[PDB]
Design a protein around this ligand. Structure first.
Ligand SMILES: [Ca+2]
Lengths: 146, 146
């Protein structure tokens, strides 16, 4: 797992039980100085054999010699507008706003495609007590308003 | 779909009238009359009482560019019985069997009879009341000049 240790080795040499010329020591399993292309991977527990694929969040990965070789899969993205004022963007990034207007939440860049609005106005007493009130969708070349 | 009890329904689902969209709009001004306007140039008027009737209006830009049981709209009426595979038919029921929208419909034929000879009790009622279109004491003689 920790390969290439000897490039940062600030110790002199002594006696003890070691490995041969190649044949790195098995850390993840329990055996001895196994060859490098028999290193079992691991992923929160399970001892994956070298060649067992797995389907993760947005990528699929295969256990190569000790390391994972991962390849991307298509997965969507979700913007959320929760509470009165808690925006979570498509890329993480949660923030608090407390507005009073119509605001452009998402719109297509080309010339037309769509535009999603949303009213974030005060609902309580002060200005810091805001609420979502109206969602407006401008679709089908911006000629249909929902 | 315009059923014969009102009941306008879009994609097998009831709609509420009026229903104005980007490409067409459906109105209902008088509860026995439906008015449909399209942006292409097509206008419909569906009558619902006493019997169901239909009136279709096209612009003169669509002249020589339609096919159906309404002809082709080119100025001549000798070629309205021209089928979609060549030649002009002779009778109305021979032309119109080429415009069936379902393949499992039977073929219909003309009827060289008049109904006022087959029914002696209906033919005096028909003579007394339809003659009001021709006599000038009624409020139908105002239209006799046009
Ligand atoms: Ca014609």
């Amino acid at each position: 797992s920790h390969l290439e240790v000897s490039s940062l080795c600030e110790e002199h040499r002594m006696d003890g039980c070691f490995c041969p010329e190649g044949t790195v020591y098995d850390d993840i399993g329990d055996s001895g100085c196994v060859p490098v292309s028999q290193c079992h991977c691991r992923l929160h527990g399970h001892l994956y054999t070298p060649g067992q694929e797995i389907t993760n969040d947005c990528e699929q990965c295969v256990c190569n010699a000790g390391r994972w070789v991962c390849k991307d899969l298509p997965c969507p993205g979700t913007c959320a507008l929760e509470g009165g004022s808690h925006i979570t963007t498509f890329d993480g990034k949660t923030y608090t706003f407390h507005g009073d207007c119509y605001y452009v939440l998402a719109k297509g860049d080309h010339n037309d495609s769509y535009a999603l609005l949303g009213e974030l106005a005060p609902c309580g007493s002060t200005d810091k007590q805001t609420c979502l009130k109206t969602v407006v969708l401008l679709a089908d070349k911006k000629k249909n308003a929902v | 779909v315009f059923k014969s009890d009102g009941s306008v329904l879009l994609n097998q689902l009831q709609v509420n009238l009026p229903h104005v969209t980007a490409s067409f709009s459906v109105f209902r001004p008088s509860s026995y009359h439906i008015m449909v306007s399209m942006a292409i140039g097509v206008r419909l008027q569906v009558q619902l009482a006493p019997v169901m009737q239909l009136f279709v209006t096209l612009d003169q830009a669509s002249q020589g560019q339609v096919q159906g049981l309404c002809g082709n709209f080119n100025g001549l009426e000798g070629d309205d019985f021209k089928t979609a595979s060549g030649l002009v038919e002779a009778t109305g029921a021979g032309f119109a069997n080429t415009w069936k929208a379902q393949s499992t419909c039977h073929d219909k034929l003309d009827w060289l009879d008049d109904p006022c000879s087959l029914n002696i009790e209906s033919a005096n009622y028909a003579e007394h009341w339809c003659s009001l279109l021709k006599k000038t004491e009624t409020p139908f003689g105002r239209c006799h000049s046009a």
